[PDB]
Design a protein around this ligand. Sequence first.
Ligand SMILES: C=C/C(C)=C\[C@@]1(C)SC(=O)C(C(C)=O)=C1O
Ligand SMILES: C=C/C(C)=C\[C@@]1(C)SC(=O)C(C(C)=O)=C1O
Ligand SMILES: [K+]
Ligand SMILES: [K+]
Lengths: 415, 415
Amino acid sequence: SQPSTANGGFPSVVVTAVTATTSISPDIESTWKGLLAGESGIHALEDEFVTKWDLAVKIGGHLKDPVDSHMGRLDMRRMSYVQRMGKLLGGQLWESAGSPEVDPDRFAVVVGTGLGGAERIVESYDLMNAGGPRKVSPLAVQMIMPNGAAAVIGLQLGARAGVMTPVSACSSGSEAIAHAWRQIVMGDADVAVCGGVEGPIEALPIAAFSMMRAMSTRNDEPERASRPFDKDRDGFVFGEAGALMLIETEEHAKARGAKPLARLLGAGITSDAFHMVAPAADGVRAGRAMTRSLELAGLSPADIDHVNAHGTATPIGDAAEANAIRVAGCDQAAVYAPKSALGHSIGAVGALESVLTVLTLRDGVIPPTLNYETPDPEIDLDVVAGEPRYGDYRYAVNNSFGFGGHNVALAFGRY
Amino acid sequence: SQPSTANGGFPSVVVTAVTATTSISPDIESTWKGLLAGESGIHALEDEFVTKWDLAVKIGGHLKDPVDSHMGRLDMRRMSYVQRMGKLLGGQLWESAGSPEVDPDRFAVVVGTGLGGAERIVESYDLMNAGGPRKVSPLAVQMIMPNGAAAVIGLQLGARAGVMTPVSACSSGSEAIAHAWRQIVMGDADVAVCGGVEGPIEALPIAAFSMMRAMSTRNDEPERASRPFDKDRDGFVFGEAGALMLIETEEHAKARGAKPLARLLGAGITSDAFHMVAPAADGVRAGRAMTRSLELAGLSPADIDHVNAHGTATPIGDAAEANAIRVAGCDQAAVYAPKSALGHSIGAVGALESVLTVLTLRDGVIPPTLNYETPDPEIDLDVVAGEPRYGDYRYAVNNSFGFGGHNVALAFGRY
Ligand SMILES: C=C/C(C)=C\[C@@]1(C)SC(=O)C(C(C)=O)=C1O
Ligand SMILES: C=C/C(C)=C\[C@@]1(C)SC(=O)C(C(C)=O)=C1O
Ligand SMILES: [K+]
Ligand SMILES: [K+]
């Protein structure tokens, strides 16, 4: 028999703590209460660099509580922003998990980003123009690196069973959590800290994605811009975030008296080999990843109650995902596109949305997909809209796809 | 029983093709013949930016055959350098594997880098200063990304079972190959293309590593600078490279009539949680990764004949590795530090050195570690030096460690 979670071939893995900072709240429990009240993180961009560059996009959500508010001049000298966000979230996640003393040699860290410390390279380059190679920080390598954040958290928490950084543009945060899962079921660790961090809303990425025609420009009503699955959607809206979760074996969780929030049952990674930035319209490979996660969970499509959609709000993006969900045999599920309230955060967002899936399972509730007012004839999904939807959600799949054609599906269970 | 390669718990995985470009040759078979004749890739740096910045480091090895010699104005417009190197090596690796038609849905790509397309971000930033957000390429995202190269190869070769990019500074190229291995033994793929690419010798990384005191400055004799394990070593020397290998199940290899070069038996990833850039002196976690690879191979330390050392040539770097190899129970093995001839290449080097391990097993030979003239009292390793050493090499472990304290060991068998 092929090994699976449900058949006992893989060990039971549970999520036992979660932390996130978003454009609604620095607290995750508060982000959840806000979503269920239909708040939006997205507003008009105040940043003077909008009128400076005369940008087509004039909306997005900054974190409600800026990372650097929790950062002194020391932290500022040795870390990139994404490292700074890493330290913050690590610190908080441990604190919430009752600050346990684990075995360092059974402890992994997996954290993705879209980009890592890119601000720091202009910085090191400008310093060297001004005053030479000696004006460049010894420190620079380890701010500079894309494994920077994972390194910082691993060091800070004392993780000795591997510190990994997968990168896959928009799905990095889910991929991280998949690999942490792989790392645990393969015997390599008993506990893992996983997720994604990502930097703030800057001019350049706005310009780059704008030029793709990927970005909403409904500037007249910022909260109404992000319309995943809606007939009238016009692209994605940026929304700052970072999210980590603590996953451990059920044995281990039971052993230290920690009530699980949910179970992580399986994970599927596949790729499109279609196009450098656009998803395969047929949605076959993305659907395949949904299947893989079920194969490994030990589940059939009939068990999936809820799908936390990637839902970026682009015309082709959502059409593709819709096809994928059919292909996976999952269109009879209640769908949520959190990106309609929280926007899109590249490396972090997959992780944040995995946190949301877990909360959905714990609380038996799906927040409304905001701005869902006209069903797309071509989509035909059961998209949760209007108010929150309470329901008997036993199993859920979190989708995460990213430019390059990268597909990550995480299958989760109610505990 | 815990699953292992040797006990049949994991499927037999073989390396069936290899390709690399290095500072000795664009051909790998030629790099191998050159090493065994004790050639060095390292020379005086001709690049005018040395006298410009008055750099302490005036040596390193550029590729013998510049990637962009194989690149036209199209390729130059849509890809970062690391993507360009990716396309080249992918193209060649397939060609050598007899250009087989595989099942796209059983086919993965795992390729690490240290940095990815960093040149491109100054480029996009400078273009936007000159002429606005509209002067920024739609294309920019997918040059910019650190998954850029893996994406390009996956697309070019048609890999539909995942395209992954691990980053862990200096060990990315080995980590990639570990995960490709994990991807295959876990049922997710039957064949995988894996390795690492990395950009050329630039001013900034020279400055950053110089400021660490990590870099040799034996400028008077460029070929004699890189002295891994030698009493007189003074740091690492840069040496450009990129390397991929094709790994598949033995079943699959047999099925298409492809003679294997070697077997990939297992892989161990662990982390130091010691320091942001320096390795743990005790070498316990690095040694642990060596052990993990043997646990999964189904081997004992007594089976390891050859260790392809990370051997960067830094005082603390090598001392640490020496401790790790004792800890793993492997100090009775013949050791090779290819970095003494080929230098260090951050994201690529782990992959190149894994290619070298495979060739060592196929050809029953270890090239001489160059510049090994005075054994360090504190090291006590059997370092191959002087001429090549022919021997009965049944199993070998390739070590790869990187800043952040990342440890990757790959265990390989003779076929
Ligand atoms: C396989 C999926 C690919 C290549 C792209 C997606 C759907 S993911 C994403 O985040 C996004 C946008 C527009 O941001 C996409 O258009
Ligand atoms: C766990 C290993 C760490 C943190 C560092 C090493 C030994 S790896 C490497 O490539 C290197 C140098 C100086 O380049 C190191 O000093
Ligand atoms: K999602
Ligand atoms: K090595």
